[PDB]
Amino acid sequence: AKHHPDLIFCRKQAGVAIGRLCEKCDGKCVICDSYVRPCTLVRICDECNYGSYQGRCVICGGPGVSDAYYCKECTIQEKDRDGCPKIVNLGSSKTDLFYERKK
Amino acid sequence: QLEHLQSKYIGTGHADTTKWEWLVNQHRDSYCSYMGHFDLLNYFAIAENESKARVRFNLMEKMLQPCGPPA
Amino acid sequence: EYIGEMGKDYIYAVTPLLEDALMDRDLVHRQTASAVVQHMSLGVYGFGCEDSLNHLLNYVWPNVFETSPHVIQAVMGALEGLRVAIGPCRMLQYCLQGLFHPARKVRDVYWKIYNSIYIGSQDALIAHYPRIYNDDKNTYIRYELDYIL
Amino acid sequence: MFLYNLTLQRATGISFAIHGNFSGTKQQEIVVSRGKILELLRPDPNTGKVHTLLTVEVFGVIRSLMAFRLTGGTKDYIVVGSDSGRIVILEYQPSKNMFEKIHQETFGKSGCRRIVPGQFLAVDPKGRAVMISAIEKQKLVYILNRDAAARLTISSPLEAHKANTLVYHVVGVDVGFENPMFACLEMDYEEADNDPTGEAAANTQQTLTFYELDLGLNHVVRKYSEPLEEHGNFLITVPGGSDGPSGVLICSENYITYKNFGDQPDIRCPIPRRRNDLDDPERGMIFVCSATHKTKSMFFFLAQTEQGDIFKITLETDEDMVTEIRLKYFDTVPVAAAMCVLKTGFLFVASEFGNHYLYQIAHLGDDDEEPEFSSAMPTFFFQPRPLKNLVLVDELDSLSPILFCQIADLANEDTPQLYVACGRGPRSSLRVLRHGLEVSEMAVSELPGNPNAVWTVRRHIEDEFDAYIIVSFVNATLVLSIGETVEEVTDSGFLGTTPTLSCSLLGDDALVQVYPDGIRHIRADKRVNEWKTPGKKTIVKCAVNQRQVVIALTGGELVYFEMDPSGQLNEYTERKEMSADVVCMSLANVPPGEQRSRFLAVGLVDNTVRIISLDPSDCLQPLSMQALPAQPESLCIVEMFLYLNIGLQNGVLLRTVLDPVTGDLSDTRSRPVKLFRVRMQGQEAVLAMSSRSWLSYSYQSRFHLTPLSYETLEFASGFASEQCPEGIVAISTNTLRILALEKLGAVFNQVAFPLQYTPRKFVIHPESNNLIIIETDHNAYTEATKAQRKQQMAEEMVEAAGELAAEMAAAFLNENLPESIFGAPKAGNGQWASVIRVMNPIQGNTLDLVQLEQNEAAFSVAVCRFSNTGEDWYVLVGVAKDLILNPRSVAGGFVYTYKLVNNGEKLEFLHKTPVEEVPAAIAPFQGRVLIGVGKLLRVYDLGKKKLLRKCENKHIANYISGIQTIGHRVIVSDVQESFIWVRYKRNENQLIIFADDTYPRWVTTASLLDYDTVAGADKFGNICVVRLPPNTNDSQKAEVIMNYHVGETVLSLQKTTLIPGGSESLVYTTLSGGIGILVPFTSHEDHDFFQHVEMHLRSEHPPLCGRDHLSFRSYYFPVKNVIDGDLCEQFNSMEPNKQKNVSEELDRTPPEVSKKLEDIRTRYA
RNA sequence: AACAGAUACUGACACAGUCCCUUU
RNA sequence: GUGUAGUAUCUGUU
Ligand SMILES: [Zn+2]
Ligand SMILES: [Zn+2]
Ligand SMILES: [Zn+2]
């Protein structure tokens, strides 16, 4: 997601695994969050696709439902040839929201 | 973060970058491009009577220490 | 963004409005105009509409010396889109003047722009580099390109 | 303004020529790689000829190519590394005749980058892993494996990166079922970039490193790293495991070394030097390529030298320890960039510049007259000699280094020819390329009469040669037969008194005589079924068949005959007559699938053809009708799914799909047209005759229409004999001719004339149509200098006190090595040689020759005339002196003037004029000339002692490359800037520039399309068109209106017309041997249609090697107003499902799209 | 220039989420 | 309605 500067990409060398998206993140681009013209499949590194993490959401980590894709603009800009777009951080909004809810 | 992405790649500079190393990167990339394409190598091997293997060997030799020693 | 190819017929209609928006009076107007420029340039890529895109680049370039992160991101996105649509030669010509500026706060911005240009399509930068006259001890001229059959 | 890119000839320059088993059979094929074309070749194992099966285009720069097979497998695969950041595995399909992509994986950005792999493509000898590497820091390993479904799979890449290192070569090590290992020639540069003194640049040596792939732990680790002595350039893999030892052979300058890890003392052997070599002793000596011929009995290597000598390396070893290396001289061939030795004893030599050759190894070259050399022996010499261990069987024509082209009409033909100046070094030549198929005449016999129709029916069906040759006169006949002596048979049983109209093959051995009085049947056996047609209205037309005799009378009175197994004639009681006569009619060949010929087509005066069914129930009863724009002339039916070629009274050929009713009609362009069916390349073709010969062949299910390159003929008949199995017996100008078309030679028949050096430019003398050619080479000797050097060397060798009395000097001065076979004695980086040649282009014989001195490098030529004189031609040659290329520096220059009196056949010296720099361009204008010396532009006029300078200008940015002028406007090409517009003012004598460009360009050539438009090429392979704004007065800038990327450097742009009656086009030729054109659209609807077709094909038919077509065409500048025609024409070879899908997206049927795509090509070219 | 207060604006930013090793 | 990152403009005290 491009709306949170704190998040961090893994972007290691990609493997043969295919990324997945949950219900909330379905139909989006893993780089810019765009609903227009999915173009190319998303692949992730074998460290991300291991054990419990297998078949989870690329963006937030929820249960995987549908495949991930790159939008046409990212493919034109060759932003797809950069490594696994899996997010490794947990974010500041999520933890604070959880703590506020569990107040 | 954009700066982590650009840091890893070889060839990118920053504020405290000198001219010699910039042109060294230019020359190395130019030699690699010459090696890559085919008709440009044919041009170089016709301009001077040398076999393509000799031209490739010379270009590879020039990759180490181009543009002279540093300051 | 929604219309990719059939958007070259409406660049003329919105060009004066974009020029008005990109004027140095307010930050958000320039931010959103830069976003429009980025999306339009990515859309019209490959269909030979570089004439108006050059004018839009000329109008959007003076905004890179900003400090707010959102405007910075919008301007960098617009510059990347214009680099894709126009070609690395024009962007290299633009960024080639301040790359060794005496001020420290200008070289870093020019180097960020140059790195963004360089990571994408460096093999074109090979053919688009400027001639440098060599120094007393260092050879700076690529004599191989001057061979003539 | 949109243009449409087309190609007439593809590149013929081989870069990689790997070999293996790709068809899955026991026959081996060769997969060669042009710059961007992937081609597969199959040499004939009986006649030695090489054939082509697939010529797919990949739209990318191929950087590496290797093949492998999995253990226990039979079919090999193909691995491709290219400019796209992907690795692709391919697989040949003999059934579909196409390449299928099996896998592709992305690992980085696109383009020929420094730190993106794709340069080296080492593969495991067994087939367990593959490795792709970059020039710097990047190495990735993939693991290949098979599944339960008998399909290959690929694993995730394994990284083996290393900072601040350079890679020279990477090869796979044969380890024999152990952990796969890879060896590389690494070299570090970390410290050398940190030593201001500069000694750290020295004392840095290559290190041989081994990378072992740990299959158990799934990671790659480097184990051994030993410094080397010299600098190696490439490695060789030694067959190990069960046969031979492991390790790699390292090739360096003047050395070859064997090394192996663990415990091994290395062995070094010096490379033998040529005896009595004329080269400078300063230079070194390296190998260029190699090969391997491992076999159960033993294995040996082959190696190629710079001079062109093939050695034969044999390793001598203990039980497991190697002891010595044994080098022996095998033969000498032209220098090549890749060699491959196959089974059956064949050697394929892919020359890096020029033609390609195929040799058959007759002897292995052991214990022969020549001695051997070994590392155990304590600088060896050898005597080169003509071929002994090789025999040439085939040659593949190619024009790899095309340097200058000029389309004109220097002969008396009506069609322009192409005069190319290809070639490099002593193998350079000038060729005459003209559209058409080559014709070879063998035997010509004169017939004193007017032969109108001849046939070549065989005596029997199982006979392999045509025994009957019935030459028919106007009122008489002439019978002939095939044999060593062709004569006239008298006792043949044929009544030779009435003219013959056709010769049928009714039975296995039966023939009939067709005359304008009926038909008499004369079978080979003693049986004649005579059947005359009494009356003033005799038979007019005739249609022979393998089992039928269908004829007709006046008024369209058709006659039908059928053969029964008994051997009689069946006449139907029907004589249906139409209102008009027959203009053309014939039967089709009898196919085994159906009983007989499917249908009969009869052309009529009313221009309506009728397709009469051959069933007795509806005999002589039509079933359909078809009209024609003009008078029908022939109705030949071509086989191979069939079509029907129609002849017309006007010079247009019409093809109709096989059907009783008319279907898709294809038209192609004042005399009657006659078609004859012959056997071409094992395929049934046709031969039309409209104004010249026209042979339409269905080669690989593709239809071509290319004329036979010969003078006009009239009649033809197929030829079959032991000497010439495939040919034509033709009659023209009342003589008997023999034709032979064995080699295909699709288009642009070639006739070459040899040269001495690399040609630079040539001009045409307008009065006499003669060429003035200037040649120049670097690192070369003139004749006199090399002769004097030879004399000095012989004197020194005599004085060397080798017994004071040595007889070797006579042999040495009597020893002359043919330079076109043994190469040229390269000397040094400052030497040059040049020569000026006046050549007749109709027949390539020199009419004059002028040799310059040492270090005289010609760079310009011009044929002009001056105002001060009248009828006085002149030749101006620009010459350099003491030119150093890489440390660029020159010492002066000169300009020569000649006189050219005797019809442009003599060159007598007039004077020479010193200049301060090298004159790069000379262009006459307005009775004077321009000479561009360095960055200075000057005007000169003829005098008596020298040329006098009038005007000058010193504002050109850099070196001046070329000059083009029109009217009072002259355009200046620059080495780095694009174009400069400068005007000459006569009243003031000032040259002032008024318009230039914005984008710098390394232009190599320029052509003027109009008063304001210039088309310029580029060093990097781009083509651009630039136009000056209309409101310009001769500061100001020019606007770019077109961009493109051919992918191959262009050295000639020229606008002219190729086919008579067509439209002019912008013909260009490139440095790799390709010939293409750019054409405009005749309608806006056509432009939108082609644009949409290109978009859809780009969408659903991506490039084979993983590149992006639009990104490829926008490699340096974004593409503008050019539509790629190769991608568009790729539609015609796609799968039917995709074809119908795309066509329905086009709102057309696939045949309509095919016709639309073909029409523009057949119009412009 | 630093400390503090107030008012507007951007990010198709998010809303019992849920934890998916927590070890003997 | 609330919380997570930022930004701009005003006012008071040194
Ligand atoms: Zn990852
Ligand atoms: Zn999600
Ligand atoms: Zn995207």
SS3 C8: helix
Q: Which two structure tokens, joined as six digits, stand for D615?
A: 């069933």
Output Rg (C-alpha) for chain A, integer angstroms: 14
Domain segments of chain B: what residues?
6-70
D665 contacts: CB under 8 Å, gap ≥ 6: D654, D655, D656
- The rounded distance, in Å, linking the Cα atoms of D329 and D311 is 5
Q: Which two structure tokens, joined as six digits, stand for D787?
A: 């002769």
Annotated binding-site residue? A32: yes
Q: Total structural domains in chain A?
A: 1
SS3 D285: coil
Q: Which two structure tokens, joined as six digits, stand for D450?
A: 């007017």
Q: What's the gap in Å between C3 CA and the centre of ligand 2?
A: 27
SS3 D446: strand
CA–C1' nearest nucleotide, residue C67: F7
- The rounded distance, in Å, linking the Cα atoms of D667 and D656 is 9
A75 contacts: CB under 8 Å, gap ≥ 6: A39, A40
Q: Which two structure tokens, joined as six digits, stand for D83?
A: 């400019």
Q: Which two structure tokens, joined as six digits, stand for D434?
A: 């003209």
- Single-letter amino acid, residue D420: V
Consecutive H or E run containing D58: none
Could you tell me which of D621, D551, D628, D560 has the C-alpha nearest to residue D582? D551
Q: What's the gap in Å between A44 CA and the centre of ligand 1?
A: 6
D388 contacts: CB under 8 Å, gap ≥ 6: D331, D363, D365, D368
Q: Which two structure tokens, joined as six digits, stand for D696?
A: 């339409």
- Terminus-to-terminus CA distance in chain B, angstroms? 34
CA–C1' nearest nucleotide, residue C28: E10
The conformational region for residue D926 under phi > 0 = left, psi -120 to 50 = alpha, else beta, is left
Instruction: Give the experimental resolution in Å.
Output: 3.1
Distance between alpha carbon C79 and the CA centroid of its chain, in Å? 4
Q: Which two structure tokens, joined as six digits, stand for D829?
A: 């980086």
- The rounded distance, in Å, linking the Cα atoms of A24 and D1124 is 43
Residue ranges with strand state E in D934-1086: 936-942, 947-953, 960-966, 969-974, 979-985, 990-996, 1006-1008, 1013-1016, 1024-1027, 1036-1037, 1039-1042, 1050-1056, 1065-1070, 1075-1080
Q: What ligand has the least distance to the C-alpha of A79?
A: 3
Could you tell me which of D412, D415, D399, D411 has the C-alpha nearest to residue D1056? D415
- The rounded distance, in Å, linking the Cα atoms of D940 and D933 is 12
- The rounded distance, in Å, linking the Cα atoms of C90 and B69 is 32
Out of C89, C141, C148, closest to residue D999 by CB: C89
Residue A26 belongs to domain spanning: 8-88
CA distances from D533 to D514, D540, D558, D899, D1122 (A): 11, 11, 13, 77, 66
- Residues forming a β-bridge with D929: D924, D940
In Å, what is the separation between the CA of C82 and the C1' of E10?
23
Annotated binding-site residue? A10: yes
SS3 A24: coil
CA distances from C21 to C17, C32, C40, D131, D1073 (A): 6, 8, 15, 53, 53
Could you tell me which of D825, D823, D834 has the C-alpha nearest to residue D782? D834
Is A8 within 8 Å of B5 when comparing Cβ atoms?
Answer: no
- The rounded distance, in Å, linking the Cα atoms of D613 and D735 is 40
Relative to beta strand D990-996, strand D1036-1037 is parallel
Q: How many CB atoms lie within 10 A of CB D390?
A: 21
- The rounded distance, in Å, linking the Cα atoms of D608 and D380 is 83
In Å, what is the separation between the CA of A63 and the C1' of E20?
9
- The rounded distance, in Å, linking the Cα atoms of D70 and A3 is 49
- The rounded distance, in Å, linking the Cα atoms of C134 and D719 is 71
- The rounded distance, in Å, linking the Cα atoms of D531 and D549 is 12
Could you tell me which of C15, C149, D112, D329 has the C-alpha nearest to residue B45? C149
The conformational region for residue D457 under phi > 0 = left, psi -120 to 50 = alpha, else beta, is beta
- The rounded distance, in Å, linking the Cα atoms of D1075 and D746 is 14
In the sheet that holds D511-515, the strands lie side by side as D511-515, D518-522, D530-532
Which residues in chain A have their CB less than 8 angstroms from residue D107's CB? 13-14, 81
Residue D834, φ and ψ in degrees, nearest 5: -145, 160
Within 47-86 of C, beta carbons closer than 8 Å to A belong to: 69, 80-81, 84
Residues for chain D: how many in total? 1165
Distance between alpha carbon D972 and the CA centroid of its chain, in Å? 33
CA–C1' nearest nucleotide, residue A103: E16
- The rounded distance, in Å, linking the Cα atoms of D207 and D187 is 6
Burial string for D1017-1052 (b: 16+ CB within 10 Å, else e) reads bbbbbbbbbbbbeeeeebeeebebebbbbbbbbbbb
Within 4-23 of A, beta carbons closer than 8 Å to B belong to: 5, 8, 11
- The rounded distance, in Å, linking the Cα atoms of D304 and D349 is 11
In Å, what is the separation between the CA of D265 and the C1' of E1?
77
Q: Given 3-state DSSP classes, what are the helix, strand and coil percentages for chain C, each rounded to the nearest 5? A: 65, 0, 35
Asked if the structure places residue A52 within a domain, the reply is yes
Relative orientation angle of helices C104-119 and C69-86, to the nearest 10 degrees: 40
Pairs across A and D, CB distance < 8 A? 26
Cβ pair D173, D209 in contact under 8 A: no
Is A82 within 8 Å of B5 when comparing Cβ atoms?
Answer: yes
DSSP D759-803: EEEEEEETTTTEEEEEEEEES---HHHHHHHHHHHHHHHHHT---
SS3 D496: coil
- The rounded distance, in Å, linking the Cα atoms of D1123 and D1090 is 8
Question: In this complex, which protein residues place their C-beta within 7 A of any atom belonging to strand E?
Answer: A 1-4, 24, 33, 35, 51-53, 56, 61-62, 93, 97-98, 101-102; C 28, 31-32, 70
Output Rg (C-alpha) for chain C, integer angstroms: 18
Q: Which two structure tokens, joined as six digits, stand for D830?
A: 């400052």
Is D975 within 8 Å of C146 when comparing Cβ atoms?
Answer: yes
Residue D588 DSSP class: P
Relative orientation angle of helices C50-60 and C27-43, to the nearest 10 degrees: 160
Cβ pair D581, D554 in contact under 8 A: yes
Within 35-94 of A, beta carbons closer than 8 Å to C belong to: 36-37, 72-73, 76-78
SS3 C88: helix
Alpha-carbon torsion angle D166, D168, D170, D175, nearest 10:
-100
In Å, what is the separation between the CA of D515 and the C1' of E12?
90
Which residues in chain D have their CB less than 8 angstroms from residue C45's CB? 1118
Relative orientation angle of helices C11-21 and C50-60, to the nearest 10 degrees: 10
Q: Give the angle subtended at the CA of D388 by the CAs of D383 and D391, to the nearest 5°.
A: 140
Cβ pair D41, D16 in contact under 8 A: no
Q: What's the gap in Å between D183 CA and the centre of ligand 1?
A: 30
D148 contacts: CB under 8 Å, gap ≥ 6: none
Relative to beta strand D273-274, strand D381-382 is parallel
Q: Touching check for B27 and chain D: CB below 8 Å?
A: no
For C116, nearest residue in chain A (alpha carbons) = A77
Asked if the structure places residue A101 within a domain, the reply is no
Distance between alpha carbon D157 and the CA centroid of its chain, in Å? 38
